Write a protein that binds this ligand. Structure first.
Ligand SMILES: [Zn+2]
Length: 513
């Protein structure tokens, strides 16, 4: 009985629930229902020029904002635009679809600082974005301190374990949007023509490396399984351990303590009401047990690649910064990503550049927390307005490549292409450094490449138009694609770029040691 199960769990927590202070309850509600920014107040604080700018800006052309930030800005844009006449509005929509032109400098610098003013107060999101590393300097300090306060108080509210009677007598459930874990597989996991069906091949991709999971925020789970909504194709079924701490929430839910591990027991395609879903069976285990598995994998992948790249065995090159629900896939796909990397790029280029990165204590960081909360970025990027979220990043100050697993890259088939793009930036860096080690600049800042960008910059991908550095990186990525057609387009549509990049590669490989 669904209702008896509910009643029995509610009874187990009944004293706890009765004992909550009003401030205790408020905190639990805030956790569940985040506090949104006030659009009207945001808009009122803009100058007339800024309002204009915001009316006509192409938000999805941004390459530094998170999904959440982008979604809020679009809503903000609707309000600002809803006094304009219909033609204006129709034109503004018609122009956005038929062209993805890059943002102007004016547009970009405006969005970068506006970023500071559009953050919701969202405790569970803050924990997921930071993987529990809540002191990370990616938001206002005073807001940071409130989060820490709230989170410490929630931890202290959640002191009562599910206990040895209930733990093996109940399942709990969580419906999940697949994009939350993999935006990349998400785009295809549903059958293209029959969306009552799951793509069997993508399903295998999703399942094959899904062995463990981490929850860094507070899971809100259903006592009784709820029929899936629109965006929900993942249906978790979870077994707690006797010492898992939790609290009861109204309408038959538990909130679980943060920092738990999950071992994946089974992943199956199931049918509910003539539609296909993915059942995930998981068991709660100590997070420490999963962190041990991650650290062992980090040790192994470094040993393997230090040997392959001829680095000292102790070299710390590859880092797993892993804290969220698709953990094991971040870890395992790193192996595949670096395989493709070595497959598609000349061995001497890879060795020369990687040694340069190692020489500056650089890293390959594979992570499922957002890039502003990665130290290899934020320790050199103090200004939140200069902090970037995206699929990947190269940070010259730390000689580090960062790769964010859960998100999906603009016009990138997979994570391997995203890594190779970022490696393009490292090549750009090393090439420029070999020109002048003292005042070390990027080779894409040389006047020659600037001249080449002005001619061929619009001849490859839409994202390549953004600027010299991105153009070089895109050109570099396409020149080393598994697809011969893509290598050929560069040679044919951007022959000076093609030649310039091959020359730099020779210059790099031929520099003496
Ligand atoms: Zn880039």
């Amino acid at each position: 009985s669904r209702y008896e199960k509910w009643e029995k769990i509610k009874q187990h927590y009944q004293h706890w629930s009765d004992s909550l202070s009003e401030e205790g309850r408020g905190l639990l509600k805030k956790l569940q229902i985040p506090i949104e920014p006030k659009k009207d107040d945001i808009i009122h604080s803009l100058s007339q020029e800024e309002k204009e700018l915001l009316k006509r800006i192409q938000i999805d052309s941004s390459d530094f904002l998170s999904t959440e930030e982008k979604e809020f800005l679009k809503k903000l844009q609707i309000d600002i635009r809803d006094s304009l006449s219909e033609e204006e509005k129709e034109l503004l929509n018609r122009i956005q679809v038929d062209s993805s032109n890059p943002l102007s400098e004016k547009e970009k610098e405006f969005l970068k600082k506006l970023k500071l003013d559009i953050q919701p107060y969202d405790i569970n999101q803050r924990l997921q974005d930071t993987g529990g590393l809540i002191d990370s300097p990616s938001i206002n300090l005073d807001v940071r301190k409130q989060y820490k306060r709230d989170i410490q108080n929630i931890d202290a509210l959640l002191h009562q374990s599910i206990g040895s009677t209930l733990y093996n007598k109940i399942y709990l459930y969580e419906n999940m949007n697949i994009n939350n874990l993999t935006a990349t597989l998400g785009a295809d996991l549903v059958d293209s023509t029959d969306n009552t069906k799951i793509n069997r091949g993508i399903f295998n991709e999703f399942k094959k490396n899904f062995k463990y999971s981490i929850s860094s925020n507070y899971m809100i789970v259903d006592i009784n399984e709820r029929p899936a909504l629109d965006n929900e194709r993942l249906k978790w079924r979870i077994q707690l351990s006797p010492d898992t701490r939790a609290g009861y929430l109204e309408n038959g839910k538990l909130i679980l303590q943060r920092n738990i591990g999950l071992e994946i027991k089974d992943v199956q395609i199931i049918k509910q009401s003539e539609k296909e879903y993915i059942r995930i069976d998981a068991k709660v285990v100590p997070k420490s047990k999963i962190d041990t598995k991650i650290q062992e994998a980090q040790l192994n992948i470094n040993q393997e690649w230090n040997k392959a790249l001829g680095l000292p065995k102790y070299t710390k090159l590859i880092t797993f910064n892993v804290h969220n629900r698709y953990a094991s896939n971040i870890v395992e796909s790193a192996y595949l990503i670096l395989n493709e990397w070595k497959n598609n790029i000349q061995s001497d280029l890879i060795k020369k550049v990687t040694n340069y990165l190692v020489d500056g204590n650089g890293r390959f960081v594979f992570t499922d927390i957002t890039l502003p909360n990665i130290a290899e970025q934020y320790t050199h990027q103090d200004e939140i307005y200069e902090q970037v979220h995206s699929k990947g990043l190269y940070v010259p100050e730390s000689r580090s490549i960062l790769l964010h697993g859960p998100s999906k890259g603009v016009e990138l088939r997979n994570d391997s292409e995203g890594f190779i793009h970022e490696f393009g930036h490292a090549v750009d860096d090393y090439a420029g450094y070999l020109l002048d080690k003292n005042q070390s600049d990027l080779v894409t800042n040389s006047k020659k490449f600037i001249d080449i960008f002005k001619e061929e910059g619009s001849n490859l991908t839409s994202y390549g138009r953004t600027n010299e550095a991105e153009f070089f990186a895109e050109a570099f990525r396409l020149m080393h694609s598994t697809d011969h057609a893509e290598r050929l387009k560069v040679q044919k549509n951007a022959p000076k770029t093609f030649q310039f990049i091959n020359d730099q590669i020779k210059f790099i490989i031929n520099s003496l040691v």
